[PDB]
Structure 1
């Protein structure tokens, strides 16, 4: 994922995603079908 792709996929920046708890990162990526 490029930085723009984080915005397109998750509606937040790469660094905002990285600020989420681990379980939430895993679940959001689960929801999108990503690994």
Structure 2
């Protein structure tokens, strides 16, 4: 995704998301059909 699309889809910035547990980063993304 682009950075703007990322923020819309996940409801936070990439930097914020990077603080989530790694396996979950995978969870919030696979659940959206993303990688």
Unmatched tracts of structure 2, length 5 or more: none
- Which structure ranks higher in relative contact order (CA pairs < 8 Å, sequence separation ≥ 6)? 1
Structure 1 consecutive aligned stretches of length 4 or more whose deviation exceeds 6 Å: none
* TM-score between the two structures when normalised by the length of structure 1: 0.78
Matched length: 35
Unmatched tracts of structure 1, length 5 or more: none
* TM-score between the two structures when normalised by the length of structure 2: 0.78
Instruction: Report the RMSD for the aligned CA atoms in angstroms.
Output: 1.0
